[PDB]
Design a binder for this molecule. Structure first.
Ligand SMILES: *[C@@H]1O[C@H](CO)[C@@H](O)[C@H](O)[C@H]1NC(C)=O
Ligand SMILES: *[C@@H]1O[C@H](CO)[C@@H](O)[C@H](O)[C@H]1NC(C)=O
Ligand code: NA
Ligand code: NA
Ligand code: NA
Ligand code: NA
Lengths: 30, 248, 30, 248
């Protein structure tokens, strides 16, 4: 639905969880 | 979840637990995709090889549970929809089911739906090496019971390697993930993690998308073996049909 | 500052501009 | 901007225009990085080879302007800070300057600051082939005057190729961008685009970051030539010093 996938305690507060960077790095790493 | 770690509070607000109503028995994982729909694996509900054939009145789902040791919502089911071509006879092809909640659930800091992928998101992120995240209350291995939700990040594996790891005929409605022997990291879903979500965070819009459903594997966190997941995008048309047409 | 880089008429309304996808694709493409 | 297109309304709310106060003359581009600080190229303010040496009272900046043919804010400057090691004598190394607004500006749908990169963002996105976006009111080439802000997306170029394209000694405080001959796309900043921002959208947090400042180039959109930009992250410590210590 329209607010899907944005977590109240993380994305909505501009806070990163402990390992999400590991996921995103895997997508951009060459 | 084997070789994972404790999830932070509110890290997976779409996490749903599927229970036998009475007596209490944790059966599988699941996910919240709207205020009234929960997604899970069909084998969590219907699996004759196991004499399993649950109906709506036999179950309950819990939403918002971070640990064992309120704020937790317990919901009844109104209707179950299993993909008509789910194949429990051979290889668990199309292992997917939707469960409609009797009443819509209220969202909170701990309860929030996950997005389902569109063609662009699936094309971009379903690539070998790209990591997803699996969460669950399955044991800590195959002997190990968590009191806090466990989480593990695993990379998607090239199809030829997935094919290679098993004798079962795999299909394009499945994908596999996990580390290779020698990549030096471990992790896998296990037992009760079945039905739970494999999610990825979009670099395009920062939202979490559920790309897979824990479906099957052989053993748990074994070298040379990988977990197989239901390819959610491949079955999107059926998912959409059910949600769009029904849900009254 | 803290709300930097999030555009009122785009990110804040969940709307994509016409070519931003071109940028993001260049970062994840192999 | 050469070979670009009309910007959508509110697409670049950090865009700032630097003007000679009186008589009116558009001098350069610039960017809003907070309610009271604007970032630009030092050569837009100080460039002896051109007998240019503007002081605070000689200028005005406009913020929030989408086109030519209210909602637009005109601000006076309180103080200009040019990097102490800006080299106008040889190669425009450290071509960067900060301008403090006399009064803080109010943010709106058309006025909003851009982020400055941290080490992680710079390491991740400053890679050959990765595209950034440049915006400006420069002419449409080198003969062509826009009434709507122009925008163009350009890929960062490998350093050996940047070095190769010019006789000037380039430094690590610069990076270059633009399409190669045969990549089949065109585009470049030009003249008055000078001082404007080169931005990239983070896949980590969905925010726009200013990675560069239009600095110099030889010609505009010429085959085999690339635009050079001030490497903002490399000069972050000085930027931070100025903003952190002053701004009263
Ligand atoms: C599950 O049980 C229902 C009875 O409500 C039956 O109609 C359906 O065919 C069963 N599925 C099996 C045993 O495969
Ligand atoms: C610019 O003018 C000021 C006078 O306020 C002078 O002190 C400074 O040295 C000048 N910069 C030049 C000519 O390089
Ligand atoms: Na990349
Ligand atoms: Na394994
Ligand atoms: Na990639
Ligand atoms: Na060129």
């Amino acid at each position: 639905e329209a607010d899907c996938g944005l977590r109240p305690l993380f994305e909505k507060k501009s806070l990163e969880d402990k390992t999400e960077r590991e996921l995103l790095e895997s997508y951009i790493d060459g | 979840i084997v070789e994972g770690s404790d999830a932070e509070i509110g890290m997976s607000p779409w996490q749903v637990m599927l229970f036998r109503k009475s007596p209490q028995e944790l059966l599988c994982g699941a996910s919240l995709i709207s205020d009234r729909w929960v997604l899970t694996a069909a084998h969590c509900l219907l699996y004759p090889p196991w004499d399993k054939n649950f109906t709506e009145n036999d179950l309950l789902v819990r939403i918002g549970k971070h640990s064992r040791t309120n704020i937790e919502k317990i919901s009844m089911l109104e209707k179950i929809y299993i993909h008509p071509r789910y194949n429990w006879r051979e290889n668990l092809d199309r292992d997917i089911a939707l469960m409609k909640l009797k009443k819509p659930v209220a969202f909170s800091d701990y309860i929030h739906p996950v997005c389902l992928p569109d063609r662009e998101t699936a094309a971009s992120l379903l690539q070998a090496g790209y990591k997803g995240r699996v969460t669950g209350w399955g044991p800590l291995k195959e002997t190990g019971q968590p009191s806090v939700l466990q989480v593990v990040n695993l990379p998607i594996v090239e199809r030829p390697v997935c094919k290679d790891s098993t004798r079962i005929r795999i299909t394009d409605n499945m994908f596999c993930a996990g580390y290779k022997p020698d990549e030096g990291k471990r992790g896998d879903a296990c037992e009760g993690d079945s039905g739970g979500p494999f999610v990825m965070k979009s670099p395009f819009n920062n939202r979490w998308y559920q790309m897979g459903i824990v479906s099957w594997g052989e053993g748990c966190d074994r070298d040379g073996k990988y977990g197989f997941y239901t390819h959610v995008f491949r079955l999107k048309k059926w998912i959409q049909k059910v949600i769009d047409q029904f849900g009254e």
